[PDB]
Amino acid sequence: AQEPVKGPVSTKPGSCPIILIRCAMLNPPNRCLKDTDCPGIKKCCEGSCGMACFVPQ
């Protein structure tokens, strides 16, 4: 079946602002992941190594 709009950690949130590339090293820390804590119009994305608040376009 399809997905009920929301449910999981958002499969279609926003778009990352593009950063360097995608740091594929080990397991870095993250200030956000699913529980985006950005007050305004931001969205936890990937800033080339680690995730954080990034505007979803």
Structure tokens at 25: 């090293």
* Other Cβ atoms closer than 10 A to 10: 13
Experimentally, the structure was elucidated by: NMR
Give the domain ranges of the chain: 1-57
Inter-residue contact 2 to 39 (CB < 8 Å)? no
* Other Cβ atoms closer than 10 A to 8: 8
Inter-residue contact 30 to 53 (CB < 8 Å)? no
Inter-residue contact 43 to 36 (CB < 8 Å)? yes
* Other Cβ atoms closer than 10 A to 36: 21
Domain 1-57 in CATH: superfamily?
Elafin-like (4.10.75.10)
